[PDB]
Symmetry: D2
Subunit: 292 residues, 4 copies
């Protein structure tokens, strides 16, 4: 539910750019079959940026329905206005979702005090477990360990998706929070390293197309079998890197379509279709992972 291989699942779309139920069902069946631990619905990889809150909610509810209790579902609930974050979270109160993934406000670059008040207010308006999400390269701000420690004192703030790729954050956060506070990687290429340092799992883009390998890798890591996990990691490393050859989720949607997991690789503007060079790069990575 908040450990192991968690997929930041794509929102598959028809050619008109609306959610494709047949494709979503196929994806969710795949994750259940693959041993994926949970699904993050309408996170970054799910095109939270270009779905309105009604559409977002429709996808989350559809994902929950189709999951049919077989696999836990975490809703993306991020917003750069605290009022909007609260409103979006309230949509899922008493819904069946097991928790929320909520990103530091983007664009407006709040202070560490602002981040504290933001997440505290959100937490106060829900009984749902909250996973903080830090990704400075996308947001323009950086939720530092000290503030994470402050926020971990709030009862329902229970973990962090740390997407900096800065591995020193693992033990910096760990020393300031209780032993049951969950540390999850948001950076596929460093996620095994992140678990080797004490992290409890990954919210993963790669898991969209290598769900089985990712589940296996994280199980091995949790068991302390890092050399064995590393063999899998090495097979997946080109995907971990090349799934960001063009902006996420352009490559991973293409990959999903290539593997027959979704009907179309359609995205919403300003995401654009994969370049020819992109296709070949990603195809090479899939081949390296043994997925073709």
């Amino acid at each position: 539910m908040f450990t192991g291989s968690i997929v930041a699942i794509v929102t598959p779309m028809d050619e008109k750019g609306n959610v494709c139920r047949a494709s979503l069902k196929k994806l969710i069946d795949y994750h259940v079959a693959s041993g994926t631990s949970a699904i993050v619905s309408v996170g970054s990889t799910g095109e939270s940026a270009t779905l309105n809150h009604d559409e977002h909610a429709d996808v989350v509810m559809m994902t929950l329905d189709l999951a049919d209790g077989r696999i836990p579902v975490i809703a993306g609930t991020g917003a750069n206005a605290t009022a909007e974050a609260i409103s979006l979270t309230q949509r899922f109160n008493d819904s069946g979702i097991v928790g929320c993934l909520t990103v530091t406000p983007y664009y407006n670059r709040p202070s560490q005090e602002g981040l504290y008040q933001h997440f505290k207010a959100i937490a106060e308006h829900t009984d749902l477990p909250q996973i903080l999400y830090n990704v400075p390269s996308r947001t323009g701000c950086d939720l530092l360990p000290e503030t994470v420690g402050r926020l971990a004192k709030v009862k329902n703030i229970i973990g962090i998706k740390e997407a900096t790729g800065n591995l020193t954050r693992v033990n910096q956060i760990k020393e300031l929070v209780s032993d049951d506070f969950v540390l999850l990687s948001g950076d596929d290429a460093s996620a095994l390293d992140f678990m080797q340092l004490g992290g409890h799992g990954v919210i993963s883009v790669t898991a969209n197309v290598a769900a089985r390998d990712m589940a296996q890798m994280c199980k091995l890591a949790a068991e302390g079998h890092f050399a064995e996990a590393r063999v899998i990691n090495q097979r997946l490393m080109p995907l971990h890197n090349k799934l960001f050859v063009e902006p996420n989720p352009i490559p991973v949607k293409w990959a999903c379509k290539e593997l027959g997991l979704v009907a179309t690789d359609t995205l919403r503007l300003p995401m654009t279709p994969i370049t020819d060079s992109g296709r070949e790069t990603v195809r090479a990575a899939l081949k390296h992972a043994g997925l073709l």
Copy 2:
């Protein structure tokens, strides 16, 4: 008007975070009297992030009404979803605004081709002049001179607010675009340098509280009187820097309240009240500028 001193105006709020018409009137009267070239309504400094589109539109309409033809108004129209940008833009068609200030999508980090398709589509569906807005520190993406050059070929894409603070961009862009394309600094501390290199004006935070000095500085710059402009710039430099001592528009709103231009310095979360240290810093800068 798209040259000279253009204020990125604060959205003054009462204690409930709602727009304060009386305060907005005072500000607009102040800019009319002080020679400001135009008003950017609900840009970053106007808390675009935390107003919903309906509130956003209300503020722009209120600003047009209060302006009453005395000073041109430019609407902030940025969104990270191309469909949303287009929809927001339509709310202002035939409103009386003279143009739109439209930011590169934030958080989703589109490619250069993505940015091209975003702004092209926005421009296609309006007759209004469009001013592009690049601010990588906030958005996570960087609209490069090559792509600005492509976009400048679109009839109604007329200029750019360049907020990198990287002065090499001025002549990189200038050489790729027609001589009527407007280059506006979005970085107060480097704006005079930007104008000296070929820039046509500034969309300014400092202009909120030093409107007359900014207007004169920009006129002198336009006339080639850089040494004379620089004397004014030097007295404003502490403001140019310290208005960002805490997240914009926290400092400038406090400054406006201290001068009596607005009734309260209230903001919306995740912006929080200025710190005591911040007040001291900002106060000092106002005094250096001769404003208190």
Copy 3:
């Protein structure tokens, strides 16, 4: 000899700026008593920058003499001219030193091919074991894992001091080199993390003044007792950070003098004496480590 807690030992000086033998002897006795694994003589912390090659060699030979076979000594041999690196290394051929620490050329920013040819040529002119040293913040260049792998194929290139503080390098290098290639941290604040990921020890500044704790921490790490090691790390973390409050080795020399380990904290220009604020910061860190 190339694992555990290795000290990048200061070059203690009299008030005239020349090596102080009495102080060097006291330091070396301290390291023997403390269980320090080896001594790096005239590395960065030893003011390699401001000693000429004759003076450098005198200090290395004095350190070797005073060690008297009780503790292995690694000579700093870095130079940004390959001819000079070769000449400096040749001074120590058949001397008693057990190996060399050789930094990527600084200032002239060679290519990865240049780095390869540099280190290959050096290795070819000596039988001594070579430890590569990467510290981009000081040198302006970055020896990447791929090139490390290339160089590890040379018989006497046997390890790396990785001072980037970028923990992802550990497993990137490890996968490209043989199992007996040594990975050492050059970044005290992340060194435990570095060992947790597979590193074999640290070449440490902190060990100058906390030799016992550092030895104990590294032993615990090598044994897989990371929680226990972490308790020591937490006690030392303020030193790990604050020993760079002013340029290394200004703080650590002051610390050594304060602990009675050296007679004077004299350095050579352009290093300047510790500031008053500096003194208090470092004193607080020593107190936190229980060393006062």
Copy 4:
């Protein structure tokens, strides 16, 4: 002379890496004929890093001799040990050089106070004009405008080569120093911008192969004819960039050989020969500049 186009001249070498007098003569004759303002002898581009001080001095003396009073010569005198800088400077006292170009210490990352004491001591022990040289990408430290202002008060500290490429530095420094203090760009690609902002000249790599165009460009810039200067700059821009496609001076030495200005393009390790791809890139840039 400390204004206009100043060439950072290559140290031409035979196949053994020894200075080639015949090639150096050709280069000097070329700069005399092409209107270059002065020659910087054994700066970065002259492989200061890989000549020992005696060879360094030989090249400077040979350059004075060949110049034969026809063009002023500035000696590179930088060292990261203040005592060494002073000693090197004395080798040139009463030599006929008109001044020294002295870099911020590299690798040891001194404080601003350290830099102050370094350059003050150097200036004290010579009558020669000193030009400070700031290039953080290479040295690991950054001489800030405040400290430049302090140093400019020293009689014989007369100017600065500012190689950051950060154009805001021009007027930050200018406002802190007297009107006779010389501001010289050390970044070819931004040099015209630097001059437009108030800079007095450039210490240039590009001038090695486009001496006449550089001399005219700088004269036009000095006269305020920026649009006319910019046309020349645009034909040189590919060289300004691609002369750093591989580490300086690898590209410019190859370019000199291709034009027939020098007999061989040999460098000293850790510089290695230009790649085939590099040749292609550089060749293209020469052609764009009209030189081949």
